[PDB]
Paper text:
When activated, CaM binds to and stimulates the activities of a family of Ca2+/CaM-dependent serine/threonine protein kinases (CaMKs), thereby regulating their functions. However, the regulation mechanism of CaMKI remains elusive. Here we report four crystal structures of three truncation variants of human CaMKIα, namely CaMKI320 (residues 1–320), CaMKI315 (residues 1–315), and CaMKI293 (residues 1–293), which correspond to the aforementioned three truncation forms of CaMKI, respectively. The catalytic core of CaMKI takes a canonical bilobate architecture, with the N-terminal lobe (N lobe) consisting of five antiparallel β-strands and a prominent helix named helix αC and the C-terminal lobe (C lobe) comprised primarily of α-helices.
In particular, the residues on strand β1 of the P-loop exhibit positional displacements of about 5–7 Å, and ATP bound at the nucleotide-binding site interacts with the surrounding residues via a network of hydrogen bonds. The CaMKI320-ATP complex displays structural features of an inactive conformation. Compared with the apo CaMKI320, although the structure elements forming the nucleotide-binding site show significant positional displacements up to 7 Å and helix αC is rotated towards strands β3-β5, Glu66 and Lys49 does not form a salt bridge which is critical for the maintenance of the active kinase. Intriguingly, in the CaMKI320-ATP complex, the CaM-binding segment mainly forms a long αR2 helix which protrudes away from the catalytic core. A detailed analysis indicates that helix αR2 of this conformation plays an important role in the maintenance of an inactive state of the enzyme through interaction with Glu102 and stabilization of the inactive conformations of helices αR1 and αD. Furthermore, the side chain of Gln305 of αR2 forms two hydrogen-bonding interactions with the side chains of Ser291 and Lys295, and thus helix αR2 also contributes to stabilization of helix αR1 in the inactive conformation.
Author numbering: 10 to 54, 64 to 163, 182 to 314
Amino acid sequence: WKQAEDIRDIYDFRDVLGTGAFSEVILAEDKRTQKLVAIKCIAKEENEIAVLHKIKHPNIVALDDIYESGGHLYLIMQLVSGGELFDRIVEKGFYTERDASRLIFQVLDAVKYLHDLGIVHRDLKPENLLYYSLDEDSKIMISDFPGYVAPEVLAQKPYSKAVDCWSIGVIAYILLCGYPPFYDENDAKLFEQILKAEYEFDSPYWDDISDSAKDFIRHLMEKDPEKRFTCEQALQHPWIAGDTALDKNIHQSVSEQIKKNFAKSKWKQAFNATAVVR
Ligand SMILES: Nc1ncnc2c1ncn2[C@@H]1O[C@H](COP(=O)(O)OP(=O)(O)OP(=O)(O)O)[C@@H](O)[C@H]1O
C-alpha cells in the first residue's frame, strides 16, 4: 500500500477497459517502467492488501500494487487482453464440452487456491472470467478479488467457502447450454427457485450433453452446502479429471442462447465479425 501525491505522476491513464457497479477498470501505463497495466478505480463508499498481494497463480490476475487518493482506491492489476468468458465463446466457431471442461478446471484450480489463502469470492460471475490473450489456446483468469449466489447466502443462513462451488456450478450450466438455470421476470419467484435449487436439463438443449457433465453440475448445484462438492472433489470428477467430456460441436445453440440471454454478446459477435474482415 502506497500514498500517491498525485497518482498521475506514476501512471498514464488511458482507455476504460470495463465498468463495474462501484468501479471502473482503466488501461494505464506505468510511467516508471513503460509496462501496461489495468487499474481498478474504486470510490471510497492493511489486512486485505496483505493476503491480496500474496496471490500468485497462473489463472488469477495479479494484484501488483495499491495507491490511495482523496476519494479513491487504485488497484494496479495485471493487464489481460483476451476479453470476457462468453464473448469469446460467442465469437469463435467451434465449441465442445471439452472446451467447457478445460475452462472449469482452471476456475476450480484458481478458486481452490484462493480458499487455501482464505479468500471467498461469493460474487464470482462470468464478467470476472477473462482470457489472458487473444489466441485460441488462451487461459482463463479470475479478475475480481443474479442467480450465481448460493441459496444459503440468500437465505441469510451461515455460509462458508462452499458458496463459490455453487457459483462455479452455475457457470458450468451456462457454459453447456447458453442460458441461466434460474430465469424469471418476477424477482420474487426467481429467488425461490434458487433457494429450492430447482432446475432441469431441459430438451433439446441438453440432448447432446453427456451424463457425466450433468452429474458433475448436479454435485456443485447442490442446495445442501455439506453435500456440495468442494473444489478438490469437483477437480477429481471424471468430467474434469477424466475423459468424459465430449467433442460434439455444440456451438451454434449455446452461442444463440447466450446472445439471447446476455445483452453484451449479440453484437460482440457482430463487432468482431466485422473487425476481423480487415
Ligand atoms: N485485469 C484486467 N485486464 C483487462 N480488463 C479487465 C481487467 N479487469 C477487469 N477488466 C474489465 O473490466 C470489467 C470490470 O471488472 P470488475 O470491475 O472486476 O468486474 P464486474 O463485473 O464489474 O464486477 P464488480 O461489479 O463486482 O466490480 C471486466 O468485466 C473486464 O471487462
